[PDB]
């Protein structure tokens, strides 16, 4: 398995494990905060993946501070982890067409 | 089996100080917040905090004057909640409850009636 | 804070009808709604989670309704075990708040 490959696998496992301290976090940041809705594993789990996708429909969003730096972290992550995905598939492409080449 | 167990109750002096327990049992999770509610004789549930052992963090109802101080104890799995310089209107019954960390209050303890009398 | 009224207080039916508890919240909160059974004595007891999703070990003639700002915990045929306080809690949005409870009146 090459580079690429392994490291698209890797930040796979990793943003996985980020979505779930991430949902973790955010509850128990958000909690104490009069007015937060980002209170229950769930929907912050839902809340983690549309922030990871940089979706962010709107539904669900931290109010506080550590919230909010746990949701940059979680944004970071999965903005890295689906760039590298597309850096590995360039590498793919880049191989395959250096090789149709003759070179 | 009964999932939360507390004692039945605890007499208080006005201005003294009671430590409330709560023995659960049955599936515990990283995810588990015990809350607990006050209810004193015909009135409603009134919520007073919560706490989530798993990580010793505890909030607290912010529209009533603070009379409590949540504490866990991961080991022997039990939840406390220390009651100080009470009087005649802390006098109530004192329920514990568990949350999965999705809302709502599956199960209750049988709850402590406090009383605070000379 | 999440404001939860119930009104009214008291409900009075005769034995076997239909009732219906009112659960009325400040602001909306989709389906964040739990209610509770507290006979007397008794400790709280969750009846329905989530408006209207069924727990176990609760009978079958007791469901819930609604979303947003309205909710409603119906009892089909309506029998002496019945005879309690009724709860709404919601978790929509910190902190959990608990509505002022409706007793139910058997009159027979």
């Known amino acids: 398995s090459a580079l690429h490959w392994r490291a698209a696998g890797a930040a796979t496992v990793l943003l996985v494990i980020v979505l779930l301290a991430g949902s973790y976090l955010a509850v128990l940041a958000e909690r104490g905060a009069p007015g937060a809705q980002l209170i229950t594993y769930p929907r912050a789990l839902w809340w983690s993946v549309e922030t990871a996708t940089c979706v962010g429909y709107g539904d669900l969003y931290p109010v506080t501070l550590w919230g909010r730096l746990v949701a940059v972290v979680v944004m970071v992550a999965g903005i890295t982890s689906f760039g590298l995905v597309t850096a590995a598939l360039a590498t793919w492409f880049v191989g395959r067409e250096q090789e149709r080449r003759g070179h | 089996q009964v999932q939360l167990q507390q004692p039945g109750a605890e007499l208080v002096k006005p201005g003294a100080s009671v430590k409330l327990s709560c023995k659960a049992s049955?599936?515990?999770?990283?995810?588990?917040?015990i809350h607990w509610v006050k209810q004193r004789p015909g009135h409603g549930l009134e919520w007073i905090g919560e706490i989530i052992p798993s990580y010793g963090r505890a909030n607290y109802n912010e529209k009533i004057q603070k009379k409590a101080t949540l504490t866990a104890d991961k080991s022997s799995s039990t939840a406390f909640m220390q009651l100080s310089s009470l009087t005649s209107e802390d006098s109530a019954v004192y329920y514990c409850?568990?949350?999965?960390?999705?809302?709502?209050?599956?199960?209750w303890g049988a709850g402590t009636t406090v009383t605070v009398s000379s | 804070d999440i404001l939860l009224t119930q009104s009214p207080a008291i409900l009075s039916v005769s034995p076997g009808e239909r009732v219906s508890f009112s659960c009325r919240a400040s602001?909306?909160?989709?389906?964040?709604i739990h209610w509770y059974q507290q006979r007397t004595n008794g400790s709280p007891r969750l009846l329905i989670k989530?408006?209207?999703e069924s727990i176990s070990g609760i009978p079958s003639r007791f469901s819930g309704s609604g979303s947003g700002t309205d909710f409603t915990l119906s009892i089909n045929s309506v029998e002496s075990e019945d005879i309690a306080n009724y709860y709404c809690?919601?978790?929509?949005?910190?902190?959990?708040?608990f509505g002022s409870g409706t007793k139910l009146e058997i009159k027979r």
């Open positions: 602001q909306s909160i989709g389906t964040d």
């Open positions: 049955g599936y515990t999770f990283t995810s588990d917040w």
């Open positions: 989530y408006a209207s």
């Open positions: 809690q919601q978790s929509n949005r910190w902190p959990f708040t």
């Open positions: 409850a568990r949350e999965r960390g999705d809302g709502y209050f599956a199960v």
